[PDB]
Structures are given as structure tokens and as C-alpha cells.
């Protein structure tokens, strides 16, 4: 029953824009909302990808590979899944593998790719694919991995056991006063709850 | 070593503002970033999202989710019940209140996350994720009564925990809904456990 009537540009930057969204509610009344969008989205199925990288090695507990970076909107450092925007013409899977190698030095193998999922749907239209990748840590390719960070990219790699993820994240928040990503926290909670 | 130097207001709506952040990169260079902030924050965080685990004897455990029209998405989304924390409210009380308004269920706090970031490349928005158990066999949860706000139109969807990821993938394939990325990450971790 609900649908968009109009989207009116309020302010556009190089990377993000704010819109006044007019939509029809299910009782037939017109209402408005203030919506954010990225300017960068072309024909990609999503703005970006986030990679769940399961590092697998013989005689080691599986690890979730995460990254720590300064995030200017947050005014501080955040722990997140490796992530980036999808390049024009790039598949989600290629972008996930590429971002994982750039951010961490690891070469992974695709396991699964989600449909487009929304990041904060009361605020923005931004979507990602969440791509699960295994890393064969016994392979020499993955022995002493070199990250290839881009222009103005400064990322630290943090590998935590899957079997103790939530507790190890709670420990980091207690020792370093950094922020954990909501998707990473949701994943760590479900690992506990199962 | 990285820090915020200044924040220039680009555009302020009633609910959302766009800002241009100047910050010092670690190579001593000044850089800028376009960021979104909500105009409603005071709190520990902008909001809460509730992970409600409906427990009913002789039944599978269910994760209780909501479906709504999200104007920024231009479509219907499936999400954890959620909202902004009122001034003076605690995360835990906002969790139980939102859960009751959106679904009718009266639950019990099990755990509460630190403030976690929603999309830290884009915004400063944060939430507490609050795990709540619902005793579906109590008489108060027999005929759950939602208390939705003016303009709020929320449909409750309870899905089994032990197949969640498969059930979501289906809702997407056969109802063209977008699943929230927190919900999805939770679902993936339930499969990825053990
Ligand atoms: O959008 C609708 O048609 C609708 C109408 C009345 C109540 C709930 C509704 O559904 C949903 F928005 F999903 F919660
Ligand atoms: Cl639980
Ligand atoms: Mg990135
Ligand atoms: Mg990057
Ligand atoms: Mg809500
Ligand atoms: Mg609400």
C-alpha cells in the first residue's frame, strides 16, 4: 500500500546528499521524511560490500578477521568487517575479495554472498552485500600477508577467535575505548546465542 | 594520532544534518569527509534495536522482527524492533518499551551492548543492541497488543531461530523486502556457529 510520491534534493555534496522524501501512508495520507543517499551509486546492486572473513588453519580455532580504522563521522576508531564501495561494473564478490586483500593482505575464497541488505533504513538508502569468505591460512599466499591500502587509507588488522568473539570484543572496548560496528556485534551475539 | 580538527555545517533539516569534517590523517595531512548526524541526540546512543527471542514450550524459539515502509529505502524492510531512546530513558527501558509498542510483547532484559555504530563511513549514528527474552507462555504475552504511534504502521513477523537465514533469504526472494544488515549478520552467525 505505501509508496514514494516524490524525492526533492535539499543538499548535495560530492559524496552524500540529503532529500525530502514525500510518500503515501496506508490510510491514504501524504507524509514527508528526510532521507540520506550516497551520490556514488550507479548500476551496482548495492553501494558496498562487507566481508565476513573466516580464517581457517589446521590446529587453530577459526578466526574472524576484522579491521580498525579512524572514522571521521564517529570522531574515533571503529572495529568493523572489511568493507568498501563496489566499483562501477565490479561484481559484489570481486569487490569483497579485492577489499579484503587491500585492507588485510589476505586472499580469500568466496563462500556465500547475501542479497542487498540495508544499513540504516530509517535514515538512508545505503545497502551492501555481506559476502562470506574463507581464508585458507595454511596457504603460503596467506603466510605473512601485506595490506595494500589506497590513497588516505590507514587500517589495522584484528583477528579474533570465532569461539570467543563477543568476549574478545567486550575486552577491546574495555581496554581501548573504541567503537564496535553494529553488524560485527550482531554477529558476535548470534555466535554466543547459538 | 588521527583526530578531528573541525566540523562545518552543510545543511540541517529537522531530523538530519550534513556536515563536512576536517581531520588529520596519520601522515600529517589534512583531509575532509562528508558525514551525516541526527539532530535528535542528547543519550549513550541515538537508539536501541531489540533482539526479541520468543520462547514458547514445545515450539521452536522465534526471533521476533518487524516489517515497515522505509521512505529512505522507497520500500518495505524487515528489521529488529527499534527506536530512539527518549531523553531520560535508559537503553534497557527504551528496549522494553519499543518492543512493547511495536509488537505487544512484554519481555525480559538478557543483555545490552555498548553503543555500536550503524554506518561509520557515513554517519555518527549509534545504538545499543538489547537481547530480550519473551515468555510466550505467560498470560500477558497471550494476546500481545501493539501500541503504535501516530504515522507508525508496523507488521510483526516471528521467524524460527534455528532456520533464520533460510527464512529471510526466502522473504527477500518471494516478497521483495530488504532485510536489515544487522538481522542478516545475526542470521549468518547462527549458521556459522560450531
Ligand atoms: O503498509 C501497509 O500496507 C500497512 C497498512 C496498515 C498497517 C500495516 C501495514 O504494513 C506495514 F507497513 F508493513 F507495516
Ligand atoms: Cl538469548
Ligand atoms: Mg573500507
Ligand atoms: Mg578501503
Ligand atoms: Mg521503530
Ligand atoms: Mg517505534
Curated annotation (Swiss-Prot), chain B:
Phosphorylation at Thr-32 is required for homodimer stability; dephosphorylation results in destabilization of the homodimer. Dephosphorylation at Thr-32 promotes the ATP-synthesis activity. Mg(2+) 1 binds at residues 82, 102. Induction: Overexpressed in cancer patients with a poor outcome. The modification Phosphothreonine is found at residue 32. Changing residue 32 to A: Impaired phosphorylation; generates ATP in the presence of diphosphate. Changing residue 15 to A: Reduces affinity for substrate about 8-fold. Strongly reduced catalytic activity and strongly reduced affinity for substrate. It holds the Pfam family NUDIX. Mg(2+) 3 binds at residues 98, 102, 152. Binds 3 Mg(2+) ions per subunit. The modification Phosphotyrosine is found at residue 60. It comes from the Eukaryota. Enzyme that can either act as an ADP-sugar pyrophosphatase in absence of diphosphate or catalyze the synthesis of ATP in presence of diphosphate. In absence of diphosphate, hydrolyzes with similar activities various modified nucleoside diphosphates such as ADP-ribose, ADP-mannose, ADP-glucose, 8-oxo-GDP and 8-oxo-dGDP. Can also hydrolyze other nucleotide sugars with low activity. In presence of diphosphate, mediates the synthesis of ATP in the nucleus by catalyzing the conversion of ADP-ribose to ATP and ribose 5-phosphate. Nuclear ATP synthesis takes place when dephosphorylated at Thr-32. Homodimer. Interacts with PARG. This is ADP-sugar pyrophosphatase. It comes from Homo sapiens (Human).
